[PDB]
Amino acid sequence: SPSYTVLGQLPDTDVYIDIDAYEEVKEIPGIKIFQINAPIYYANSDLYNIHTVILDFTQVNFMDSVGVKTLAGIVKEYGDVGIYVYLAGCSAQVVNDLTSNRFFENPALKELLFHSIHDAVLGSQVREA
Numbered sequence: 725s726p727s728y729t730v731l732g733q734l735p736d737t738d739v740y741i742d743i744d745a746y747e748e749v750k751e752i753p754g755i756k757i758f759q760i761n762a763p764i765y766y767a768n769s770d771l772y773n774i775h776t777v778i779l780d781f782t783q784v785n786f787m788d789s790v791g792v793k794t795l796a797g798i799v800k801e802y803g804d805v806g807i808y809v810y811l812a813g814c815s816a817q818v819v820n821d822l823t824s825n826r827f828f829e830n831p832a833l834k835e836l837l838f839h840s841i842h843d844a845v846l847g848s849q850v851r852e853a
Contacts, residue, residue, distance in 0.1 A: 727769070728758045731749075732752075738842035754776065755776045755845060776845075778809075778810045778812055782812075784814070793825070799836065806853070810848070813839070
């Protein structure tokens with residue numbers, strides 16, 4: 725799909741790239757990592773034993789209200805079955821767009837934000853069940 729890319733980890737590093745880019749790159753058991761390549765309502769359409777989904781926002785320069793609402797639905801619905809959705813690599817501007825569209829109306833959702841994919845992977849290691 726052009727709207728998202730499945731990422732894996734290069735073994736014994738903090739490097740995450742396209743699962744199809746290099747043979748030894750492997751997904752982490754219990755975690756799905758998706759790089760967002762188009763506004764999230766496109767990726768969401770494709771969506772339509774995992775404890776964590778990590779969404780890599782490195783490529784995202786801004787979000788619109790429809791995108792933030794979509795994202796909120798994704799976080800909520802995974803959350804309802806105990807799966808955490810983490811947001812990695814959000815720029816200041818993207819965080820501003822999330823905030824303006826009241827994504828953090830519950831300040832607890834601030835805990836879903838991580839600077840890098842690896843930070844998010846490490847955040848999933850031990851946590852509130």
